[PDB]
């Protein structure tokens, strides 16, 4: 069922559970998850994009979601 | 047979870029609707202003028209299928989830697959996805 890594699971959750209308920017991802390296976050983002959970709303750093239930 | 052969699935030239399943309980963005030119024409304006698609284009395949659109708002595949299947009162409909957007568009722009109309100025780009 959950075909995602525990690390990515949290990353995706942080974006969809963010109380910000802008969602969660790339600069915010590393801000919240300081233990998450840029290289790791970029990979996760790409995977989450292929998983169709997140997307670039109006910028590559401006991440937003909708369905991740 | 003796007339226009109506298929119940997508052409082998695009099956390689499709998820095949429509009842897949997962989120998606790229959706393709294999239908009639008249039907795809209506959906072209309807879906565009219904899901605020980032890209929508009508392509010619072989015997029918293929409506290719990408919805920014994340939603389940079956959610779109129910909407499309509902408009099959005057014509059939083959809407399935697209596995590879850019890749499918690449095939939809070669020899048999012609490009009629599209919203974006030159198909899909890197601005519609994430590098």
Coordinates of N, CA and C in Angstrom, one line a residue:
Chain A
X1 N 0.8 -1.2 0.0 CA 0.0 0.0 0.0 C 0.9 1.3 0.0
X2 N 1.5 1.5 1.1 CA 2.4 2.7 1.2 C 3.7 2.5 0.5
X3 N 3.7 2.7 -0.8 CA 4.9 2.5 -1.5 C 5.9 3.7 -1.5
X4 N 6.1 4.2 -0.3 CA 7.0 5.4 -0.1 C 7.9 5.1 1.1
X5 N 9.0 5.8 1.2 CA 9.9 5.7 2.3 C 9.4 6.5 3.5
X6 N 9.7 6.1 4.7 CA 9.3 6.7 5.9 C 9.7 8.2 5.9
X7 N 10.9 8.4 5.4 CA 11.5 9.8 5.3 C 10.7 10.6 4.4
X8 N 10.3 10.1 3.2 CA 9.5 10.8 2.3 C 8.1 11.0 2.7
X9 N 7.6 10.0 3.5 CA 6.2 10.0 4.0 C 6.1 11.3 4.9
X10 N 7.1 11.6 5.7 CA 7.0 12.8 6.5 C 7.1 14.1 5.7
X11 N 8.0 14.1 4.7 CA 8.2 15.2 3.8 C 6.8 15.6 3.1
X12 N 6.2 14.6 2.5 CA 4.9 14.8 1.9 C 3.9 15.3 2.9
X13 N 3.9 14.7 4.0 CA 2.9 15.0 5.1 C 3.1 16.4 5.5
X14 N 4.3 16.9 5.7 CA 4.6 18.2 6.1 C 4.0 19.2 5.2
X15 N 4.1 18.9 3.9 CA 3.6 19.8 2.8 C 2.0 19.9 2.8
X16 N 1.4 18.7 2.9 CA -0.1 18.7 2.9 C -0.7 19.0 4.2
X17 N 0.1 19.0 5.3 CA -0.4 19.4 6.6 C 0.1 20.7 7.0
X18 N 0.5 21.5 6.1 CA 1.0 22.9 6.3 C -0.1 23.9 6.3
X19 N -0.2 24.7 7.4 CA -1.2 25.7 7.5 C -1.0 27.0 6.7
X20 N -0.1 26.9 5.7 CA 0.3 28.0 4.8 C -0.4 27.9 3.5
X21 N -1.0 29.0 3.0 CA -1.7 29.0 1.7 C -0.8 28.8 0.5
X22 N 0.5 29.1 0.8 CA 1.6 28.9 -0.2 C 2.0 27.4 -0.3
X23 N 1.6 26.7 0.7 CA 1.9 25.3 0.8 C 3.2 25.1 1.6
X24 N 4.3 24.7 0.9 CA 5.6 24.5 1.6 C 6.7 24.7 0.6
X25 N 7.4 25.8 0.6 CA 8.5 26.1 -0.3 C 9.7 25.1 0.0
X26 N 10.6 25.0 -1.0 CA 11.8 24.2 -0.9 C 12.6 24.7 0.3
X27 N 12.6 26.1 0.4 CA 13.4 26.7 1.5 C 12.7 26.4 2.8
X28 N 11.5 26.0 2.8 CA 10.7 25.8 4.0 C 10.9 24.3 4.4
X29 N 11.0 23.4 3.4 CA 11.2 22.0 3.7 C 12.5 21.8 4.5
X30 N 13.6 22.4 4.1 CA 14.8 22.2 4.8 C 14.8 23.0 6.1
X31 N 13.9 24.0 6.2 CA 13.7 24.8 7.4 C 13.1 24.0 8.5
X32 N 12.0 23.2 8.1 CA 11.3 22.4 9.1 C 12.1 21.1 9.4
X33 N 12.6 20.5 8.3 CA 13.3 19.3 8.4 C 14.8 19.6 8.2
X34 N 15.4 20.1 9.2 CA 16.9 20.5 9.1 C 17.8 19.3 8.9
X35 N 17.3 18.1 9.3 CA 18.1 16.9 9.1 C 17.9 16.4 7.7
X36 N 17.2 17.1 6.9 CA 17.0 16.7 5.5 C 17.9 17.5 4.6
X37 N 18.8 16.9 4.0 CA 19.8 17.5 3.1 C 19.1 18.0 1.8
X38 N 19.6 19.0 1.1 CA 19.0 19.5 -0.1 C 18.9 18.4 -1.2
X39 N 20.0 17.7 -1.3 CA 20.1 16.6 -2.2 C 19.0 15.5 -2.0
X40 N 18.7 15.3 -0.7 CA 17.7 14.3 -0.4 C 16.3 14.8 -0.6
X41 N 16.1 16.1 -0.3 CA 14.8 16.7 -0.5 C 14.4 16.8 -1.9
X42 N 15.4 17.2 -2.8 CA 15.2 17.3 -4.2 C 14.7 16.0 -4.8
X43 N 15.4 14.9 -4.3 CA 15.0 13.5 -4.8 C 13.6 13.2 -4.4
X44 N 13.3 13.5 -3.1 CA 11.9 13.2 -2.6 C 10.9 14.0 -3.3
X45 N 11.2 15.3 -3.6 CA 10.3 16.1 -4.3 C 10.0 15.5 -5.7
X46 N 11.0 15.1 -6.4 CA 10.9 14.5 -7.7 C 10.0 13.2 -7.7
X47 N 10.2 12.4 -6.6 CA 9.5 11.2 -6.4 C 8.0 11.5 -6.1
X48 N 7.8 12.5 -5.3 CA 6.5 12.9 -4.9 C 5.7 13.5 -6.1
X49 N 6.5 14.1 -7.0 CA 5.9 14.7 -8.2 C 5.5 13.5 -9.2
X50 N 6.3 12.5 -9.2 CA 6.0 11.3 -10.1 C 4.8 10.6 -9.5
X51 N 4.7 10.7 -8.1 CA 3.6 10.0 -7.4 C 2.4 10.9 -7.5
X52 N 2.5 12.0 -8.2 CA 1.4 13.0 -8.4 C 0.8 13.5 -7.1
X53 N 1.6 13.7 -6.1 CA 1.1 14.2 -4.8 C 1.4 15.7 -4.7
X54 N 2.5 16.1 -5.2 CA 2.9 17.6 -5.1 C 3.2 18.1 -6.5
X55 N 3.2 19.4 -6.6 CA 3.5 20.0 -7.9 C 3.9 21.5 -7.8
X56 N 4.6 21.9 -8.8 CA 5.1 23.3 -8.9 C 3.9 24.2 -9.2
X57 N 3.4 24.9 -8.3 CA 2.2 25.8 -8.5 C 2.6 27.0 -9.5
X58 N 3.5 27.8 -9.0 CA 4.0 28.9 -9.8 C 5.5 29.1 -9.8
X59 N 6.1 28.1 -9.3 CA 7.6 28.1 -9.2 C 8.1 26.7 -8.8
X60 N 9.3 26.3 -9.1 CA 9.9 25.0 -8.8 C 10.1 24.9 -7.3
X61 N 10.2 26.0 -6.6 CA 10.4 26.0 -5.1 C 9.1 26.1 -4.4
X62 N 8.1 26.6 -5.1 CA 6.7 26.8 -4.6 C 5.9 25.5 -4.7
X63 N 6.1 24.6 -3.7 CA 5.4 23.3 -3.7 C 4.0 23.4 -3.1
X64 N 3.1 22.7 -3.7 CA 1.7 22.6 -3.2 C 1.1 21.3 -3.5
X65 N 0.1 20.9 -2.7 CA -0.5 19.6 -2.8 C -2.0 19.7 -2.9
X66 N -2.7 18.5 -2.9 CA -4.1 18.5 -2.9 C -4.6 17.2 -2.4
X67 N -4.2 16.1 -3.1 CA -4.6 14.8 -2.7 C -3.4 13.9 -2.3
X68 N -3.5 13.5 -1.0 CA -2.4 12.7 -0.5 C -3.0 11.8 0.7
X69 N -4.3 11.5 0.6 CA -5.0 10.7 1.5 C -4.8 9.2 1.3
Chain B
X1 N -13.6 -4.7 -40.1 CA -14.9 -5.1 -40.5 C -15.3 -4.5 -41.9
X2 N -16.2 -3.6 -42.0 CA -16.6 -3.0 -43.2 C -16.7 -1.5 -43.1
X3 N -16.7 -1.0 -41.8 CA -16.8 0.4 -41.5 C -15.7 0.8 -40.6
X4 N -15.8 2.0 -39.9 CA -14.9 2.5 -39.0 C -14.8 1.6 -37.7
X5 N -13.6 1.0 -37.5 CA -13.5 0.1 -36.3 C -13.3 1.0 -35.1
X6 N -14.3 0.8 -34.2 CA -14.3 1.5 -32.9 C -13.6 0.7 -31.8
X7 N -12.4 1.2 -31.3 CA -11.7 0.5 -30.3 C -12.3 0.8 -28.9
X8 N -11.8 0.0 -27.9 CA -12.3 0.2 -26.5 C -11.1 0.5 -25.6
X9 N -9.9 0.8 -26.3 CA -8.7 1.1 -25.6 C -7.9 2.1 -26.4
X10 N -6.8 2.5 -25.8 CA -5.8 3.4 -26.5 C -4.9 2.6 -27.5
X11 N -4.4 3.3 -28.5 CA -3.5 2.7 -29.4 C -2.1 2.3 -28.8
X12 N -1.6 1.2 -29.3 CA -0.3 0.6 -28.9 C 0.8 1.7 -28.8
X13 N 0.7 2.7 -29.6 CA 1.7 3.8 -29.7 C 1.7 4.7 -28.5
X14 N 0.6 4.6 -27.7 CA 0.5 5.4 -26.5 C 0.3 4.6 -25.2
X15 N 0.1 3.3 -25.4 CA -0.1 2.4 -24.2 C 1.2 2.3 -23.4
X16 N 2.3 2.6 -24.0 CA 3.6 2.6 -23.3 C 3.7 3.8 -22.3
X17 N 2.9 4.8 -22.5 CA 3.0 6.0 -21.7 C 1.7 6.1 -20.8
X18 N 0.9 5.0 -20.7 CA -0.3 5.1 -19.9 C -0.2 4.1 -18.7
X19 N -0.9 4.5 -17.7 CA -1.0 3.7 -16.5 C -1.9 2.5 -16.6
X20 N -2.7 2.5 -17.7 CA -3.6 1.5 -18.1 C -4.9 1.5 -17.2
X21 N -4.6 1.3 -15.9 CA -5.7 1.3 -14.9 C -6.3 2.7 -14.7
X22 N -7.6 2.7 -14.5 CA -8.3 4.0 -14.2 C -8.9 4.0 -12.8
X23 N -9.1 2.8 -12.3 CA -9.7 2.7 -10.9 C -8.6 2.6 -9.9
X24 N -7.4 2.9 -10.3 CA -6.2 2.9 -9.4 C -6.4 4.0 -8.3
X25 N -6.3 3.5 -7.1 CA -6.5 4.4 -5.9 C -5.2 5.2 -5.7
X26 N -4.9 6.1 -6.6 CA -3.7 6.9 -6.4 C -4.0 8.3 -7.1
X27 N -3.2 9.3 -6.8 CA -3.3 10.6 -7.3 C -2.7 10.7 -8.7
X28 N -3.2 11.5 -9.5 CA -2.7 11.7 -10.9 C -2.9 13.1 -11.4
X29 N -2.3 13.5 -12.5 CA -2.5 14.8 -13.1 C -2.8 14.8 -14.6
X30 N -2.0 14.0 -15.3 CA -2.1 13.8 -16.7 C -3.2 12.8 -17.0
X31 N -4.2 13.3 -17.8 CA -5.3 12.4 -18.2 C -5.6 12.6 -19.7
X32 N -5.9 11.5 -20.4 CA -6.2 11.5 -21.8 C -7.5 10.9 -22.1
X33 N -8.3 11.5 -23.0 CA -9.6 11.1 -23.3 C -9.7 10.8 -24.8
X34 N -9.8 9.5 -25.1 CA -10.0 9.0 -26.5 C -11.4 9.1 -26.9
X35 N -11.8 10.0 -27.7 CA -13.2 10.1 -28.1 C -13.4 10.7 -29.5
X36 N -14.6 11.2 -29.7 CA -14.9 11.8 -31.0 C -14.5 13.3 -31.0
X37 N -14.2 13.8 -32.2 CA -13.7 15.2 -32.3 C -14.8 16.2 -31.7
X38 N -16.0 15.9 -31.9 CA -17.1 16.7 -31.4 C -17.2 16.6 -29.8
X39 N -16.9 15.5 -29.3 CA -17.0 15.3 -27.8 C -15.7 15.9 -27.2
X40 N -14.6 15.7 -27.8 CA -13.3 16.2 -27.3 C -13.3 17.8 -27.4
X41 N -14.1 18.3 -28.3 CA -14.3 19.7 -28.4 C -15.0 20.3 -27.3
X42 N -16.0 19.7 -26.8 CA -16.8 20.1 -25.6 C -16.0 20.0 -24.4
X43 N -15.3 18.9 -24.2 CA -14.5 18.7 -23.0 C -13.4 19.6 -22.9
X44 N -12.9 20.1 -24.1 CA -11.8 21.0 -24.2 C -12.1 22.3 -23.5
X45 N -13.3 22.8 -23.6 CA -13.7 24.0 -22.9 C -14.2 23.8 -21.5
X46 N -14.9 22.6 -21.4 CA -15.5 22.3 -20.1 C -14.4 21.9 -19.0
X47 N -13.6 21.0 -19.3 CA -12.6 20.5 -18.4 C -11.6 21.7 -18.0
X48 N -11.3 22.5 -19.0 CA -10.4 23.6 -18.9 C -10.8 24.5 -17.8
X49 N -12.1 24.9 -17.8 CA -12.7 25.8 -16.8 C -13.3 25.1 -15.6
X50 N -13.1 23.8 -15.6 CA -13.7 23.0 -14.5 C -12.6 22.6 -13.5
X51 N -11.4 22.2 -14.0 CA -10.3 21.8 -13.2 C -9.1 22.7 -13.3
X52 N -9.3 23.8 -14.1 CA -8.3 24.7 -14.3 C -7.0 24.1 -14.8
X53 N -7.1 23.2 -15.8 CA -6.0 22.5 -16.4 C -4.8 23.4 -16.8
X54 N -3.6 23.0 -16.5 CA -2.4 23.8 -16.9 C -2.2 23.7 -18.4
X55 N -2.6 22.5 -19.0 CA -2.4 22.3 -20.4 C -3.5 21.4 -20.9
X56 N -4.0 21.7 -22.1 CA -5.1 21.0 -22.7 C -4.9 21.0 -24.2
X57 N -5.0 19.9 -24.9 CA -4.8 19.9 -26.3 C -5.6 18.7 -27.0
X58 N -6.1 19.0 -28.2 CA -6.8 18.0 -29.0 C -5.9 17.4 -30.0
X59 N -5.7 16.1 -30.0 CA -4.8 15.5 -31.0 C -5.5 14.5 -31.9
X60 N -5.1 14.4 -33.1 CA -5.7 13.4 -34.0 C -4.9 12.1 -34.0
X61 N -5.5 11.0 -33.8 CA -4.8 9.7 -33.8 C -4.9 9.0 -35.1
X62 N -6.0 8.2 -35.2 CA -6.2 7.4 -36.4 C -7.7 7.5 -36.9
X63 N -8.6 7.0 -36.0 CA -10.0 7.1 -36.4 C -10.8 8.0 -35.5
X64 N -10.1 8.5 -34.4 CA -10.8 9.4 -33.5 C -9.9 10.5 -33.0
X65 N -10.4 11.2 -32.0 CA -9.6 12.4 -31.4 C -9.2 12.0 -30.0
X66 N -8.0 12.5 -29.6 CA -7.5 12.3 -28.3 C -7.3 13.6 -27.5
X67 N -8.1 13.8 -26.5 CA -7.9 15.0 -25.7 C -6.9 14.7 -24.5
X68 N -5.8 15.5 -24.6 CA -4.8 15.4 -23.6 C -4.8 16.6 -22.7
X69 N -5.0 16.4 -21.4 CA -5.0 17.5 -20.5 C -4.3 17.2 -19.2
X70 N -3.8 18.2 -18.5 CA -3.1 18.0 -17.2 C -3.7 18.8 -16.2
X71 N -4.3 18.2 -15.1 CA -4.9 18.9 -14.0 C -3.9 19.2 -12.9
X72 N -3.7 20.5 -12.5 CA -2.8 20.9 -11.5 C -3.3 20.3 -10.1
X73 N -4.6 20.5 -9.9 CA -5.2 20.0 -8.6 C -5.1 18.5 -8.5
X74 N -4.4 18.0 -7.5 CA -4.2 16.6 -7.3 C -5.6 15.9 -6.9
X75 N -5.9 14.8 -7.6 CA -7.1 14.0 -7.3 C -6.9 12.6 -7.8
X76 N -7.8 11.7 -7.3 CA -7.7 10.3 -7.7 C -8.1 10.2 -9.2
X77 N -7.6 9.1 -9.8 CA -7.8 8.9 -11.3 C -9.3 8.6 -11.5
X78 N -9.9 7.7 -10.7 CA -11.3 7.4 -10.9 C -12.2 8.6 -10.7
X79 N -11.8 9.6 -10.1 CA -12.6 10.8 -9.9 C -12.9 11.5 -11.2
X80 N -11.9 11.5 -12.1 CA -12.0 12.1 -13.4 C -12.8 11.1 -14.3
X81 N -12.6 9.8 -14.2 CA -13.2 8.8 -15.0 C -14.8 8.9 -14.8
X82 N -15.2 9.1 -13.6 CA -16.7 9.2 -13.3 C -17.3 10.4 -14.1
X83 N -16.6 11.5 -14.1 CA -17.0 12.7 -14.8 C -17.1 12.5 -16.3
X84 N -16.0 11.9 -16.8 CA -16.0 11.7 -18.3 C -17.0 10.6 -18.7
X85 N -17.1 9.5 -18.0 CA -18.0 8.4 -18.3 C -19.4 8.9 -18.3
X86 N -19.7 9.9 -17.5 CA -21.0 10.4 -17.4 C -21.5 11.1 -18.7
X87 N -20.6 11.6 -19.5 CA -20.9 12.3 -20.7 C -20.8 11.4 -21.9
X88 N -21.2 10.1 -21.7 CA -21.2 9.2 -22.8 C -22.6 8.8 -23.3
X89 N -23.4 9.9 -23.4 CA -24.8 9.7 -23.8 C -25.0 9.7 -25.4
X90 N -24.0 10.4 -26.0 CA -24.1 10.5 -27.5 C -22.8 9.9 -28.2
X91 N -21.8 9.6 -27.4 CA -20.6 9.0 -27.9 C -19.8 8.3 -26.8
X92 N -19.1 7.3 -27.2 CA -18.3 6.5 -26.3 C -17.2 7.3 -25.6
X93 N -16.4 6.7 -24.8 CA -15.3 7.4 -24.1 C -14.2 6.5 -23.5
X94 N -13.0 6.8 -23.8 CA -11.9 6.0 -23.3 C -10.9 6.9 -22.6
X95 N -11.2 7.2 -21.4 CA -10.3 8.0 -20.6 C -9.5 7.2 -19.6
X96 N -8.2 7.3 -19.7 CA -7.3 6.6 -18.8 C -6.2 7.5 -18.3
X97 N -5.5 7.0 -17.2 CA -4.5 7.7 -16.6 C -3.2 7.7 -17.4
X98 N -2.5 8.8 -17.5 CA -1.3 8.9 -18.3 C -0.1 8.8 -17.4
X99 N 0.8 7.8 -17.7 CA 1.9 7.5 -16.9 C 3.1 8.5 -17.2
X100 N 3.2 8.9 -18.4 CA 4.2 9.8 -18.9 C 3.6 10.9 -19.7
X101 N 3.5 12.1 -19.1 CA 2.9 13.3 -19.8 C 3.8 13.7 -21.0
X102 N 5.0 14.2 -20.8 CA 5.9 14.7 -21.8 C 6.1 13.6 -22.9
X103 N 6.3 12.4 -22.4 CA 6.5 11.2 -23.3 C 5.3 11.0 -24.2
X104 N 4.1 11.0 -23.6 CA 2.9 10.8 -24.4 C 2.7 11.9 -25.4
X105 N 3.0 13.1 -25.0 CA 2.9 14.2 -25.9 C 3.9 14.1 -27.1
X106 N 5.0 13.5 -26.8 CA 6.1 13.3 -27.8 C 5.5 12.4 -28.9
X107 N 4.8 11.4 -28.5 CA 4.2 10.4 -29.5 C 3.0 11.1 -30.2
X108 N 2.3 11.9 -29.5 CA 1.1 12.6 -30.0 C 1.5 13.8 -30.9
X109 N 2.7 13.9 -31.3 CA 3.2 14.9 -32.2 C 4.0 14.4 -33.4
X110 N 3.8 13.1 -33.6 CA 4.5 12.4 -34.7 C 3.6 11.8 -35.8
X111 N 4.0 11.9 -37.0 CA 3.3 11.4 -38.2 C 1.8 11.2 -38.1
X112 N 1.3 10.0 -37.6 CA -0.2 9.8 -37.5 C -0.9 10.7 -36.5
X113 N -0.2 10.9 -35.3 CA -0.7 11.8 -34.3 C -0.4 13.3 -34.6
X114 N -1.5 13.9 -35.1 CA -1.3 15.3 -35.4 C -1.8 16.2 -34.3
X115 N -1.4 17.5 -34.3 CA -1.7 18.4 -33.3 C -2.7 19.5 -33.8
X116 N -3.9 19.5 -33.3 CA -4.9 20.4 -33.7 C -4.8 21.7 -32.9
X117 N -5.3 21.7 -31.7 CA -5.3 22.9 -30.9 C -4.8 22.6 -29.5
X118 N -4.1 23.6 -28.9 CA -3.5 23.4 -27.5 C -3.5 24.8 -26.8
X119 N -3.5 24.8 -25.5 CA -3.5 26.0 -24.7 C -2.0 26.6 -24.6
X120 N -1.1 25.7 -24.3 CA 0.3 26.1 -24.2 C 0.9 26.4 -25.5
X121 N 1.8 27.4 -25.6 CA 2.5 27.8 -26.8 C 3.7 26.9 -27.2
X122 N 3.4 25.7 -27.5 CA 4.5 24.7 -27.9 C 4.5 23.5 -27.0
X123 N 3.3 23.0 -26.7 CA 3.2 21.8 -25.9 C 3.6 22.0 -24.5
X124 N 3.9 20.9 -23.8 CA 4.3 20.9 -22.4 C 5.8 21.3 -22.3
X125 N 6.1 21.9 -21.1 CA 7.5 22.3 -20.9 C 7.9 21.9 -19.4
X126 N 9.1 22.4 -19.0 CA 9.6 22.1 -17.7 C 8.9 23.0 -16.6
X127 N 8.2 24.0 -17.1 CA 7.5 24.9 -16.2 C 6.2 24.3 -15.6
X128 N 5.8 23.2 -16.2 CA 4.5 22.5 -15.8 C 4.8 21.4 -14.8
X129 N 6.1 21.1 -14.7 CA 6.5 20.0 -13.7 C 7.6 20.5 -12.8
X130 N 8.4 19.6 -12.2 CA 9.4 20.0 -11.3 C 10.7 19.3 -11.7
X131 N 11.8 20.1 -12.0 CA 13.1 19.6 -12.3 C 13.8 19.0 -11.2

